[PDB]
Design a protein around this nucleic acid. Structure first.
Ligand code: NA
Length: 282
DNA sequence: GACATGATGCCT
DNA sequence: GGCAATCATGTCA
């Protein structure tokens, strides 16, 4: 019913492929031509479907009945998930050769910052496939099924996670520190200690998110990128990044990444998806 | 089974 | 730089 525009080029197969690898069973459904998932805007809940239209560079958003009242907030969420604000002619004209290979590359955002936080935490150490299994387990155990769309389940809400038993989450296959971290993150969301949208001083914000238990530099940086759609952050502590920077240490990688300001976030994404990439020997 | 390795948090 | 950490895989006695 709703239509949003985007500025070509846009690589929909990469975006959907990125979201597919991380899809939580019963929450999201990712196809080649569309994306769908349960969605809760406050006491309102339902299913959102995003169907791109490469031809007319338009994204069609469909909403089940229960979300109609809060349509705009739903559109705002899909626009942050799919990064429709992106001006590729600017980012590429800044990353040079680094982006030449994938010009329609976008920053996968999120639909709800608290949810992205959960994911960030359970995305530590393990592979993308195991973090996905973990998040599915947490969802099946703490989420709520939709009334009118039984196949779907809503992602666990902060209140429910704040009440959870640490051991109950642990027994799902995660370290206790990780389980406790989720419980603390949920309590921050409950009271508002968790910035739900990008703040004025991202750096200072991350610095504070780093005081929470179970949340370190990788998690806060990753959260900022995905949950706040922050455009200028790098993940030097990332397992695949250290592998892209053979030998170089995190701090090194840091000064080296600076050359990509203020689009470091996009650079991280291009480097993640450039199989044999390596730094241009200084 | 005792290890050790693959895929972040946090302390000294 | 080391200790803690979970599930999955691969050695080795
Ligand atoms: Na911390």
């Amino acid at each position: 019913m709703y239509t949003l525009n985007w500025q070509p080029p846009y690589d929909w197969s990469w975006m959907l492929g990125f979201l597919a690898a991380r899809a939580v069973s019963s929450v999201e459904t990712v196809a080649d031509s569309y994306y769908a998932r349960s969605l809760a805007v406050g006491e309102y809940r339902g299913v959102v479907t995003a169907i791109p239209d490469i031809a007319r560079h338009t994204l069609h958003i469909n909403l089940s009945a229960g979300l109609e009242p809060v349509a705009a907030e739903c559109l705002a969420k899909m626009s942050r998930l799919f990064d429709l604000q992106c001006n590729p002619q600017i980012v590429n004209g800044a990353l040079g050769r680094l982006g030449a290979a994938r010009p329609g590359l976008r920053l996968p955002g999120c639909v709800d910052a608290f949810e992205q936080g959960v994911r960030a935490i359970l995305g530590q150490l393990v592979s993308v496939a195991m973090a996905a299994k973990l998040t599915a387990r947490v969802a099946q155990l703490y989420g709520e099924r939709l009334d009118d769309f039984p196949e779907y389940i809503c992602f666990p809400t902060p209140q429910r996670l704040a009440a959870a038993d640490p051991q109950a989450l642990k027994a799902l296959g995660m370290p206790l520190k990780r389980a406790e971290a989720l419980i603390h993150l949920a309590n921050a969301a409950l009271e508002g200690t968790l910035p739900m949208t990008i703040p004025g001083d991202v750096e200072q914000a991350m610095k504070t998110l780093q005081t929470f238990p179970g949340i370190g530099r990788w998690t806060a940086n990753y959260f900022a990128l995905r949950g706040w759609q922050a455009k200028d952050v790098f993940l030097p502590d990332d397992y695949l990044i250290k592998q892209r920077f053979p030998g170089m240490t995190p701090a090194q990688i840091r000064r080296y990444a600076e050359r990509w300001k203020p689009w470091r976030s996009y650079a991280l994404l291009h480097i993640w998806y450039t199989e044999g990439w390596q730094p241009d020997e200084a």
